[PDB]
C-alpha cells in the first residue's frame, strides 16, 4: 500500500486550463472513491471534488461548471482537469484515497497550483560571507541569499547536501515587486572560516537554474 504520487502543477497564466495527474500504486483504483482537497497557504483545508466507484462525480459550488475530474483505470491515473482558471484558486492540492463515510484515509504528496503573475523568473544569488560581526566565540555563520524569483518552489542546499548541521533555510518572503526572496544560513566553527568547502547549490525546478556559489570570509 505505497501510492498516491502527484505531479503537473505550477506556473500558469489565468484563463488557461490544466489536467493534473495523481497516480497511485498497489491498489485497485477502480473499486473505490477518490477525492480532491485544496490547502490555501495561509488557510485551512477545503474539499474540492469526489468520484465514485460506480463513477458518479460531485464538486464544490465555486468550481461548478469549471472543473472536470476523470480517471483511467487501465493506467491507474486520476485526472483533475481544471478550466477557466481564476486568480484565487492558487492553493496546493491533494489527491486523497477515500473510504466509506468519506474519510480521506490515504493522502497524496501535493503539487502547487499558481495562477499567472509576474511570469516565471530565475533567482539572483549572492553569498553572505562569514564575518566577525557574525562570529561569536567558537562559531561563525555564513550563507547564501537567493532573491527575486516568481516560481515559488526553489531549493538551496549546502555542499551538494553534505552539511546538515546548522543549515537553516528561512521562509521565502514575497516583496511588493511580486517576486519571492529568501536566504539560507549555516553556522560552522570559527576556526573553520575558509578552511573547508561551503558551496550553496541553488536549483530552480520550474525553470532549469542550477548554480553553485562559494561563501568565503570578507576580503
Amino acid at each position: 500500500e505505497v501510492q498516491l504520487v502527484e505531479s503537473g502543477g505550477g506556473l500558469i497564466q489565468p484563463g488557461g486550463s490544466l489536467r493534473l495527474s495523481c497516480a497511485a500504486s498497489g491498489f485497485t483504483v477502480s473499486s473505490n472513491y477518490m477525492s480532491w482537497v485544496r490547502q490555501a497557504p495561509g488557510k485551512g483545508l477545503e474539499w474540492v471534488s469526489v468520484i465514485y466507484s460506480g463513477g458518479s462525480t460531485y464538486y464544490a459550488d465555486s468550481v461548478k461548471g469549471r472543473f472536470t475530474i476523470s480517471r483511467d483505470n487501465s493506467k491507474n491515473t486520476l485526472y483533475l482537469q481544471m478550466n477557466s482558471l481564476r486568480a484565487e484558486d492558487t492553493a496546493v492540492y491533494y489527491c486523497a484515497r477515500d473510504y466509506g463515510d468519506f474519510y480521506f484515509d490515504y493522502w497524496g504528496q501535493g503539487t502547487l497550483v499558481t495562477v499567472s503573475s509576474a511570469s516565471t523568473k530565475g533567482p539572483s544569488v549572492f553569498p553572505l560571507a562569514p564575518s566577525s560581526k557574525s562570529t561569536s566565540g567558537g562559531t561563525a555563520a555564513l550563507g547564501c541569499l537567493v532573491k527575486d524569483y516568481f516560481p515559488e518552489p526553489v531549493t538551496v542546499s549546502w555542499n551538494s547536501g553534505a552539511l546538515t548541521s546548522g543549515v537553516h533555510t528561512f521562509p521565502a518572503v514575497l516583496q511588493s515587486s511580486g517576486l519571492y526572496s529568501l536566504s539560507s544560513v549555516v553556522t560552522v566553527p570559527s576556526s573553520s572560516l575558509g578552511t573547508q568547502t561551503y558551496i550553496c547549490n541553488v536549483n530552480h525546478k520550474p525553470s532549469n537554474t542550477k548554480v553553485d556559489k562559494k561563501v568565503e570570509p570578507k576580503s
Partner: peptide, 21 residues
Amino acid sequence: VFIFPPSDEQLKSGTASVVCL
C-alpha cells in the same frame, strides 16, 4: 544575533539588502 552588510556584488546591481539574524 548577527548582522550582515550587503555584498559588494549587490551594490553593483544598485540595491542593498542588510540582513540581521
